Amino acid sequence: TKQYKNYVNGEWKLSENEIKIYEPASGAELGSVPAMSTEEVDYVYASAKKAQPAWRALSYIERAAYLHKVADILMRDKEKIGAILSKEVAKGYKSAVSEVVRTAEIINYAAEEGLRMEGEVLEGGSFEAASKKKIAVVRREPVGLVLAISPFNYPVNLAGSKIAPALIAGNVIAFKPPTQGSISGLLLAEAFAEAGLPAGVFNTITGRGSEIGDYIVEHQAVNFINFTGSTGIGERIGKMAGMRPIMLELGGKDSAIVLEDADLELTAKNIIAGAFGYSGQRCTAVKRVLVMESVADELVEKIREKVLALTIGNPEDDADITPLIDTKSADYVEGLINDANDKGATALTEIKREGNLICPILFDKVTTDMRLAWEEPFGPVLPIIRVTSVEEAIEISNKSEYGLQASIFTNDFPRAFGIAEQLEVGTVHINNKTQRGTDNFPFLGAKKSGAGIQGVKYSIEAMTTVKSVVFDIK
Amino acid sequence: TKQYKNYVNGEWKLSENEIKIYEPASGAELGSVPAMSTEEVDYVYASAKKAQPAWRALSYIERAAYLHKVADILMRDKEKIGAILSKEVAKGYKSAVSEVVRTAEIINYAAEEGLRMEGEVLEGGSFEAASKKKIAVVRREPVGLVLAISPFNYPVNLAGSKIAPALIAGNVIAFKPPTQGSISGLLLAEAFAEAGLPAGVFNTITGRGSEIGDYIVEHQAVNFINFTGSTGIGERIGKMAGMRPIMLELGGKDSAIVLEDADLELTAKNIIAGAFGYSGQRCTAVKRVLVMESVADELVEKIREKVLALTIGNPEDDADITPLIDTKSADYVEGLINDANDKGATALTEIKREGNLICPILFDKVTTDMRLAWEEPFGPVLPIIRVTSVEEAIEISNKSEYGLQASIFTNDFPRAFGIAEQLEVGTVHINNKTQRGTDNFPFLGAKKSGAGIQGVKYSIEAMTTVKSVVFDIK
Amino acid sequence: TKQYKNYVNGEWKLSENEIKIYEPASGAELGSVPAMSTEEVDYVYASAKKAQPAWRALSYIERAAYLHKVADILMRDKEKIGAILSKEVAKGYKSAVSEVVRTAEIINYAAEEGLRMEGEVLEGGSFEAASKKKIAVVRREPVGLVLAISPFNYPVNLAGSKIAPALIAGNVIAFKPPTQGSISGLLLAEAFAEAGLPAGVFNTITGRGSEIGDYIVEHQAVNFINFTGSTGIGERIGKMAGMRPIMLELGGKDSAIVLEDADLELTAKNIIAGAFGYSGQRCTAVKRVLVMESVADELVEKIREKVLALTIGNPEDDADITPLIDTKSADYVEGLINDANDKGATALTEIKREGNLICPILFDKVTTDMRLAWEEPFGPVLPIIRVTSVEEAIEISNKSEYGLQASIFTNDFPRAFGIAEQLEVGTVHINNKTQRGTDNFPFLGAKKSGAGIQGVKYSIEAMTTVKSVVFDIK
Amino acid sequence: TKQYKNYVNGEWKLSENEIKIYEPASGAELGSVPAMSTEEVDYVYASAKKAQPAWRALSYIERAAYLHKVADILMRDKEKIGAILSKEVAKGYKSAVSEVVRTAEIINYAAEEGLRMEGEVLEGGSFEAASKKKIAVVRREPVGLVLAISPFNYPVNLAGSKIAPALIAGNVIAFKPPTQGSISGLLLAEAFAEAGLPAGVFNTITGRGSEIGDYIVEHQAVNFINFTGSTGIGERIGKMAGMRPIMLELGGKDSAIVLEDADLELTAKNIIAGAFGYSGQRCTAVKRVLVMESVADELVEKIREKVLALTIGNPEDDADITPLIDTKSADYVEGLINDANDKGATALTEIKREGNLICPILFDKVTTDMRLAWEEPFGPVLPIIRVTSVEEAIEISNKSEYGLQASIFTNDFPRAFGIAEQLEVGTVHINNKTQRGTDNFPFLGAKKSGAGIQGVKYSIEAMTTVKSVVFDIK
């Protein structure tokens, strides 16, 4: 079909071999992306390295100007990009357009945030009297070449969240979108190409993991690896990074702790939106409800009728529950469903699969003995775990190897804050479903959920180092 | 029989096996330290993890109080600790006492800095109108268990630089001093024991690398590795750490760029001080002079004479040049000296070695094909490299795999700042020798020199994470 | 008599005339303080201005060391100083000792905060491309001579809160304690004298307002006026200061808003402590309760019995309620009491006065027509105003000319924050009485309550200015 | 003729009386502005007070969007506004258009700077162990109604520097342009009207000082006074403000210190540009040269030749030297000239006045006895004061009642920094003429030059207060 090309050193390049991409919801051929060689990756890196000095030499306002233009182009082509993105990752069309819009928003915000990254002046006299004439002028500097790897669920948005912060600070980029999402990633590249950023500043890489997977990370040209994906690959990247800085956004199994004094209707609505969005294919999402026994029956019934209201179908029809990314993912989800059922869990909503389209399932009576209580499904299945104390909810919650976010539903805020402190997660939302939401806020995880702090200002400081110049006055 | 003990969970413990430590200069037996088994390391970690919650539960001021007490004790016992330190690593007595004082200074400063790590409140309305009532209360939290490993050249100072910043924030510690320097590390431990920190908060580990080296780092109880040592072991740690946070301070080959308008006497004075301090056994130290040809002859003559004025002898005599840490090191340094001489470099001092005491030597006309132009000696040998332009000096300086610090001797400050920007190092001192000096300043190194930003405040930030609590205002 | 002396330019000086000071609770002569002339004030100012450059020239750590020494001395002498303070301002004995401890805490904290006031480096390229090589090195500097004036209720504590932050930054001090409290102020001066600060750095001023009141403020030598006192005196200082920087802490009429979902026992306990501490002679203290009608009867009954539990008597007996500072104050408070009584307010405690000792009294059914609803009594009298909605409570609270702090008692935090945003005050405490509490927190008041932001870091920032050095990099 | 109207509460309003404005260079009538009454001022303030809560209730991004729109309109009409601005204040056309561009720049920057308003979270445990569960959530709030008063020399630019920072934070504005510059001010008002900001958020006031001068400042509805103008008027506002926060930008007598090692040609060019810009009608401008005797003759000759190259004439011809603002201004300048001449000063360039057009004059041999050595002329007259030491230069410089900025021309940077620390000014430029330059940098003056710190972020911080909410975690 349409043969897409990689953007390398200001030029569009096809490769000798290609990878055909198909729509998860229909199997229809979407087009093809290049299957790059290691030699081709070498060229991308060499081009970026050559271009970095001149890019860093520009003023901050000039780099922000380029980024603003990119965002403007995305807004202009949001329908065009959204249409393909919707088809490529089986995401509802309007939701796909939303991803592009949020990408433009983050890119603009990072542009303005990045030009406000001030330095500091330190006094020697603060530490020792003899060094009172000694001052340190410390300023921020880019790390060099940043390798950005986006995920299939947010191939464009979670690409811009890494790209914009890196670029504003003077770093150059090598963007590797997920294969299932590479066409959308190359469409994102078109915006950078049209914006006119100097050749070599922004480049893209597409190909098979077996061929270039480790190669792109182990390459000595790369000064920083910013990745969103599976924990297994994140672990491997950490090792391959060696001593080089990294940022990892891995899995999540966000717990929603529900106390006896919680607004059950508000809780139920939040749990529904958080758990079933994009068919549960989101890292930050309610994946387990730890509810006090006395209010469990009532909450569960409220959630059951709300699950029945969810639409199920195709991405072009903006259905709440769309087909999962692939067959293997759907099979994995079933294994979890089977395990729970076999161990005694109660499916309160119909268990049905058509192709890779699994209907939303509410599982009550879920125990810690079930895989569903621990493993991230990335499917439309929600387990309810009944607890008898806040202490139990906290131990169950913390036992997870994941620690992205948590939700606390209660009307006792001081208590909510105390519980929040004990929870091994990056962010705790009080009376609200978990969310990366409001991109200026920090986004991070504890334990196996990741490494490094995201959020615009934080991602900016992460991909920058400092240069200290010390001298004596008089 | 002067068998030192590890401090584990509030108690002093011997091990089945011991490691006898000898004075590098006289060969005299100083005593022995425990050769811990893998199971004993397990207990240390179990003890720390068990006590971490209660330690974090204390107020910041209480943790600072404990730290100030440790500093007071170190100051009180500076002569006694310095006496043993001097003998253990063949460091001049006065310099050994100074290391203890600086350790007390860093501990006190970290205690107070850590009390002031303010949190931040973010507005949802800054990014999205619909989220104007949503705010994020972001506060710092400890990472858990920090594994601190100090170097032979500063077993106490570069132990406290890790321990204090970690402790003030709510982290617990497992301290691994270098084997040659473990007695001194255990002396530091005594101060922590006398200060009365809760059992398990501060613990020590001693043993053979062949038995516990990898084990202490690969242990999943460890949440952070803070290390100062060889680049080879540093690389290994990066891999073994996985995706866990690390701080690494590895080698250096600091260049002293001398321009035509430099104050030659001042430049000579600084070069000598920096190059030969502790017989060149310092990471931050002038290890190569890149001098403009026109002033080369004059500078070299000054340095030549100053080298011959350096005192050579024993630690108890406060000699500038003392015996190197061990035989293997002296063999290595002598090999470097011979390589330069055999290759035709102009030796300006006799080549002389007695035991592991290598007399200071200056080499002029050092070329890029000579090992001394690149390898970190950790010995009293200084290469002079003549350049034709600042352009050339910058190229040679940046060619090194090391990038700790650099010195620039010139009276043209605007141009000095311009050169600093291009130099791939952490800190650039103008008209002063390189130095970690004034511990509130950032201490870091580009390329293979390390990972992470040191200096008191930066160390605290590095060993802490963030917890964000988000809620809507009504 | 026991004649005290002023500390001026490193020497203790008596004046031609003096002022005899008597104990408010007994009438016994406590001693005398100098009644300075305008020429003696000129010398004090001349001495400080002369010593300022050398004081500014010292390192930050040196100035911090001097301050730590002062705090150490105050801690040693807390009982000796507190005993006289207790007698001088009729404050409970143990409470007076607590004030000296708090002063030492403030001094120590300010010393450590002030050595960490980092500077910043700004980039011209953030604003315009043509200025990308232009940077601004911005560092803090002292304002010069600071005139610190403490209040009668905290002559030592509210002296240290101004003196320490000013001194650490490099400013010199002229300390004017209140006449009734001048002996205690001079005792504080002894600690500074023993600490050994350079002559002229710290000086005291004592005398009659009719002779030097306006003179000390109008003097051109003074660069900053930091005052705590009556709203009237504060109002004229703002005028007399011209365009010179000032800090004013004036009266308050803190409201405690009690909602229907409040924990009444906790509310009653806090209101009692806040309203009656030091017989109501505190700027930050609950001075009016705005309670929802539904819970009014129960709350009032609780507060009623708790007032009857308050100890009444002499300062030496640690009574909760001690005699007021003077006759004029007691007459004023008795007039406010009679106004409420004659107008029909429900007195829930007997009206009694012995000497200048007014017994604690609670008034319910207080209307806006009564003086007690608006005027700051600085006496042990608490009005209860019944409201029918939080809207009404907010209207009433904001109607006051005062806006220092406010308390909100409720279990609905989101709503509490929303109400806080509408209240015209500096600080809002949720489920706790108002308080200057933990001096690291900001302390400020809207409207007639003052000007400037206090609390340690804020006080330092306020008494310092900025110096920006701009240069181009080559 | 062209009758201009004030923008009041979303409406354009004319007054019963009017003030006709004439061009300073031609005497030709440009039009008229309303001569407001105290009652009309009352309405404007009432309007803004009513609209403030709703303006404050909007999200930060919404307020930034309004500001960006204003900036875009300004850029669109930069030639139209610049045309009138040029004639109204006798400023060269291109310079007038340039003023408009900088205004849109400051507004855009303030919008994005303010958008990033974040508070802080403080720990009670940092100060007291007993308060470890107590935290302070500190957030910024607007002060309310800001009275912005711009100067004749920058009626639009120095209106926007006050307006945008105020508006982004949620404050409402009352804009009082200078009578001679009110038409241009009302033209700026058109952009705010077209951008569609809510009625009452932005309002304008014009009229006679004898009628509304003091009224506008004394008014109780005003919460902050931001003014740029004469020192005398500033002193008046300082008193009239009482305890209310203000920002004052007053006179300047910027000294240019020239050392023996200065690049004389660069120095001369800078002095010429800074001293003669807008015929010397700038606060931040080289107003006195303190040059070392040894290089004085050479520098003076260079400056003399460059003065003769300056153009003299009409605004529409972009002349460097244009007629002064009014007759009294020109009379004052002539008085300063006479004094210097009568006292022995040497006029190296022709003394000539036609109308209010005074040709550029270079005065050599100027002494401290002459008025021209101290008073701000606001005319094209530059005095050279020869010194024999840096010590004398600093003394002469600091003796001034003004302390806005200063320039140091020397190649010895460490010394330059040491001198900078000694100079009583807000900003020191090394080897560059003084300038408010890059509005992100702080702009402030010492002594009689003003009050408060300007520069975008600083201006935003000044017109905002803080609201602290304190609670204990359970």
UniProtKB/Swiss-Prot annotation, chains A, B, C, D:
Binding site for substrate: 102, 153-154, 282-284, 436
Leading EC class: oxidoreductase
Binding-site positions, NADP(+): 150, 176, 179, 214, 229-250, 376
Record's catalysed reaction(s): D-glyceraldehyde 3-phosphate + NADP(+) + H2O = (2R)-3-phosphoglycerate + NADPH + 2 H(+)
InterPro entries: Ald_DH/histidinol_DH, Ald_DH_C, Ald_DH_CS_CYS, Ald_DH_N, Aldehyde_DH_dom, ALDH-related_metabolic_enz
UniProt-recorded Gene Ontology molecular function terms: glyceraldehyde-3-phosphate dehydrogenase (NADP+) (non-phosphorylating) activity; glyceraldehyde-3-phosphate dehydrogenase (NADP+) (phosphorylating) activity; lactaldehyde dehydrogenase (NAD+) activity
PANTHER family attached to this UniProt entry: ALDEHYDE DEHYDROGENASE
Descriptive protein name: NADP-dependent glyceraldehyde-3-phosphate dehydrogenase
Organism annotation: Streptococcus mutans serotype c (strain ATCC 700610 / UA159)
